[PDB]
Design a protein around this ligand. Structure first.
Ligand SMILES: Cc1nc2c(-c3cccc(Cl)c3Cl)c[nH]c2cc1CN1CCNCC1
Length: 504
């Protein structure tokens, strides 16, 4: 759960909450509603409140006087399980002990406040399934709410139905007319999710899934983008973010002492269940199986999402490319940005040959395009001539230092080319995609590519679901797609791709 995040709170409301309803060690996180990608962690300690800034420009959450994290949930998990670690500017330890829980329902998938009764009925009737539900504000009784639920089989023949349950708001708590009174709609829904309501004649009002309203027909993207552009994008994104607490999968291998220095950022780590395991390592190397990389399998083409190489991981990077039979690499950072190293140069200069441990790489030819450079590399294993394969490195060079491109056309041209190269090579393995930490630009590029592939096969007349696709990729590497700016950009790129298919 993720109740310590408060989407709609001011700095002063945050202090007031912590001072009046928290104790020393209580904490909450919140957005800045001006500056997007700015967050604040507010912590009570010694009877006063501290505000700690968290910045995300697209690559990671950067806690001031702390570490870099792939999600806020991973950030909170880390500090709640590691005392003495978060520190004030002038030295002192800041303890995160007691989450201060938020009552606001606006980020719950099931909350559709504005929805009217008939609007709710049609949605559940057309889009919904057995156990699909939503909660809406009452029209007849202001301040109250309505739970609307579809139940039945899986044509319109009476096999299914919608029932409406009134939720009263009484002196600040919520109820369904009897029993327990709840501090929040979330507590109410969670309770009736585990303990379903039974109608008098024995229909069970099972709350199985929130109604899906994000699945759209690709042809109607422009219409969804229009609707979301009225800040709805913030809403839909934060709803996705609320579900990141479901994705706290183990990352034990990356936490091994032997693997610590193989990670660019010590707490941005590959999930165990999807990490790329390297075989045939040096038998004098106690741990030679680890690289900070995960397989991303869409639910024909798969990806490896990885970090920019460190000087001490370049040999492992090439062992991975060879082992997985990858024939295309996508790089989405310059080697250096804002004077800081984002990815060491792991390839030879044009026309040169270098050995990287047991792997040999020749840079055959570099071709410069407007937004990218293409390097044609030849990769082989030392001592084995017949292992040579060409690996095409697509190096995107014009991504802005912070935030996202103001137009998706360069990225889409680039991905179209990457896609065709990959499709031209029989039995090519996964496409390697990396930036700096390998979660923000990397996740943005992979998600766009997945979505555009669907359309590419099926056409404008098919279903896409942007946040569902992102949740699926985020179950395979932590924090894939970092910011609301990237989220918006994914929609703008799909929109742009669709319009260019209508113009042809
Ligand atoms: C229904 C819904 N679903 C989503 C998802 C979503 C989709 C598929 C899988 C997963 Cl795990 C997720 Cl989170 C991300 N944003 C969403 C927004 C909504 C609707 N809004 C309406 C306004 N009030 C907040 C809800």
């Amino acid at each position: 759960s993720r109740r310590w995040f408060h989407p709609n709170i001011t700095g002063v409301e945050a202090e007031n909450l912590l001072l009046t309803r928290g104790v020393d060690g209580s904490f909450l996180a919140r957005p800045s509603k001006s500056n997007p990608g700015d967050f604040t962690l507010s912590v009570r300690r010694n009877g006063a409140v501290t505000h700690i800034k968290i910045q995300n420009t697209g690559d990671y959450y950067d806690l001031y006087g702390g570490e870099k994290f792939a999600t806020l949930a991973e950030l909170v998990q880390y500090y709640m399980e590691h005392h003495g670690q978060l520190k004030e500017k002038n030295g002192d330890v800041i303890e995160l002990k007691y989450p201060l829980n938020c009552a606001d329902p606006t980020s719950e998938r099931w909350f559709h406040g504005h929805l009217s009764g008939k609007e709710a009925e049609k949605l559940l009737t057309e889009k919904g399934k057995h156990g699909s539900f939503l909660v809406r504000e009452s029209q007849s009784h202001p301040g109250d709410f309505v739970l609307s639920v579809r139940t039945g089989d899986d044509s319109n023949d009476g096999k299914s139905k919608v029932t409406h349950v009134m939720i009263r708001c009484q002196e600040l708590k919520y109820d369904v007319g009897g029993g327990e009174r709840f501090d929040s709609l979330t507590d109410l829904v969670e309770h009736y999710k585990k303990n379903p309501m039974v109608e008098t004649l024995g229909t069970v009002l099972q709350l199985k899934q929130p109604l899906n309203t994000t699945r759209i027909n690709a042809a109607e993207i422009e219409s969804r983008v229009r609707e979301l552009s009225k800040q709805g994008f913030w809403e839909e994104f934060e709803t996705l973010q609320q579900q990141e607490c479901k994705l706290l999968y183990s990352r034990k291998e990356g936490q091994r002492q032997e693997n610590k220095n193989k990670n660019r950022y010590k707490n941005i780590l590959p999930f165990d269940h999807t990490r790329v395991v390297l075989h045939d390592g040096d038998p004098n190397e106690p741990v030679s199986d680890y690289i900070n990389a995960n397989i991303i399998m869409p639910e024909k083409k798969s990806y490896i999402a990885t970090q920019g190489c460190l000087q001490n991981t370049v040999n492992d990077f090439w062992r991975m490319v060879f082992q997985e039979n990858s024939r295309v690499i996508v790089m989405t950072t310059k080697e250096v940005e804002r004077g800081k190293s984002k990815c060491v140069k792991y390839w030879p200069d044009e026309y040169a040959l270098k050995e990287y441990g047991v792997m040999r790489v020749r840079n055959v030819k570099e071709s410069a395009a407007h937004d990218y450079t293409l390097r044609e590399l030849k990769l082989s294993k030392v001592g084995q001539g017949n292992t040579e394969r060409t690996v095409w490195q697509y190096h995107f060079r014009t991504w802005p230092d912070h935030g996202v491109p103001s137009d998706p056309g360069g990225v889409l041209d680039f991905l179209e080319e990457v896609h065709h190269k990959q499709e031209s090579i029989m039995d090519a393995g996964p496409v390697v995609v990396h930036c700096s930490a390998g979660i923000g630009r990397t996740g943005t590029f992979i998600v766009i590519d997945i979505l555009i592939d669907i359309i590419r096969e099926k056409g404008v007349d098919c279903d896409i679901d942007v946040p569902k696709t992102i949740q699926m990729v985020r179950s395979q590497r932590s924090g894939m797609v970092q910011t609301e700016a990237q989220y918006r950009f994914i929609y703008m790129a799909v929109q742009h791709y669709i319009e260019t298919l209508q113009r042809r």
